[PDB]
Amino acid sequence: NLEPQPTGAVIIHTTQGDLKVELFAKQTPLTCRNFLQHSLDGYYDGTIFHRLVPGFIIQGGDPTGTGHGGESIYDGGAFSGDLDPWPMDQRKGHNAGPMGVNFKDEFHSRLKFNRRGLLGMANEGAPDTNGSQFFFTLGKAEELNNKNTLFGRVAAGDTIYNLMKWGEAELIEGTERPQYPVKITNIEILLNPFPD
Asked: What is the DSSP letter of 140?
């Protein structure tokens, strides 16, 4: 079996090598928009991969580097007009209204965390609590199926070797924080599948 064709792509440039990433934007449009818009805006520039669970996941995307920060682009009803990407009437619960925060999960039957090199959206451990943080798998992680949106994968080529080396980093004792974290320098958009 094969995943559906990804429709977007970026290169994440870091202090510890490049990672070329394909995005399942057809299947996960809100999640891919959030990631790409933040990328374009420079929101992830200088952010680190602050959390490493060896053999499982490595996580970043937090401008505070704590694991507890970051915001989605949708917060406060941004992009909630009738002709916008996520109209207000589609938002439920705490995602809704002028004080709304976070955005919905986007699960898909052909997107499963079955191997390393898959890009997922981190959340708060409850439904529809996606902000700005994202992670890559470092091994099979099917326990994340129907818990985290899966929105991309490492692209063909040799950059997967960088991800796997990041997964072997030394940790600060008593933490999941690498002693020498990977830092994003910039994100280069190769193919943006969303309309102007």
From this structure: -
Domain definitions of the chain by residue range: 1-196
* Two tokens, residue 19: 């990672």
Distances in whole angstroms, Cα of residue 164 to Cα of each of 71, 137, 160: 27, 9, 6
Question: Does residue 2 sit in helix, strand or coil?
Answer: coil
Resolution of the structure, angstroms: 1.3
CATH 2.40.100.10 fits 1-196, yes or no: yes
CA distance 184 to 14: 4
CA–CA separation, 43 vs 164, rounded Å? 24
User: What are the residues facing 135 on neighbouring strands?
Assistant: 59, 120
Q: Where are the alpha helices (DSSP H) in the chain?
A: 29-41, 160-166
Of 28, 31, 69, nearest in space to 48 by CA: 69
Residue type, 73: I
Give the C-alpha separation, 155 to 113, whole Å: 15
Residue 157 zone, left/alpha/beta (φ > 0; ψ -120 to 50; rest)? left
Angle at 27 between CA 165 and CA 95, to 5 degrees: 95
